[PDB]
Design a protein around this ligand. Sequence first.
Ligand SMILES: CC(=O)N[C@@H]1[C@@H](O[C@H](C)C(=O)N[C@@H](C)C(=O)N[C@H](CCC(=O)O)C(=O)O)[C@H](O[C@@H]2O[C@H](CO)[C@@H](O)[C@H](O)[C@H]2NC(C)=O)[C@@H](CO)O[C@@H]1O
Length: 174
Amino acid sequence: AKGTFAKAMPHVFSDEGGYVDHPKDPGGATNMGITLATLSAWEGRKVSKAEVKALTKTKATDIYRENYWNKVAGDDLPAGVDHATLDFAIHSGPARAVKMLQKVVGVDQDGVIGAKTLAAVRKMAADRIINELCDARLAWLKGLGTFSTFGKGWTSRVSRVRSRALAFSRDSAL
Ligand SMILES: CC(=O)N[C@@H]1[C@@H](O[C@H](C)C(=O)N[C@@H](C)C(=O)N[C@H](CCC(=O)O)C(=O)O)[C@H](O[C@@H]2O[C@H](CO)[C@@H](O)[C@H](O)[C@H]2NC(C)=O)[C@@H](CO)O[C@@H]1O
């Protein structure tokens, strides 16, 4: 739903903070959650750590809007489903998030929201989609080698996303 983006993104920026660089962790340095590879994709060239450190909130917002929200068709997903899919997309990429949403609603997992995906999403209850997608996300994260390091924090993140998504799903302005 269109109005979810303005509601969800302040929580993303709040939960992320500014520049975070833990070089002993995989993924590399981030600013407001934006990684170096994602900024490189935006700029059309491999950027430096200093460029990530200097990232503006305006550019971060454009990146989240165009390369995450729009790549999961957030405007067109049901309220709540949009938020659950967006956070998964932020954490693991839009293709993996949409593939898991497609697995939940029972369509071909190609990572892109098309007509068959929208039809199957709108045939199911929104809070059921939210719960099954967050469960499928947890099951998928447990297969990663990095789960031994980040799993407890990941589990807490999914729980908070599931709660806010189900809330958005019953927000009368969405
Ligand atoms: C420790 C931790 O959670 N760090 C994450 C960090 O994610 C690291 C790289 C990660 O490991 N995420 C796990 C969940 C994951 O999905 N790993 C698979 C492994 C597949 C396999 O092993 O087969 C992968 O890396 O693909 C994540 O950055 C996102 O990383 C995705 C995957 O790279 C990109 O698609 C996204 O565009 C990118 N988002 C933005 C806004 O830039 C960032 C977001 O704020 O917040 C934390 O810093």
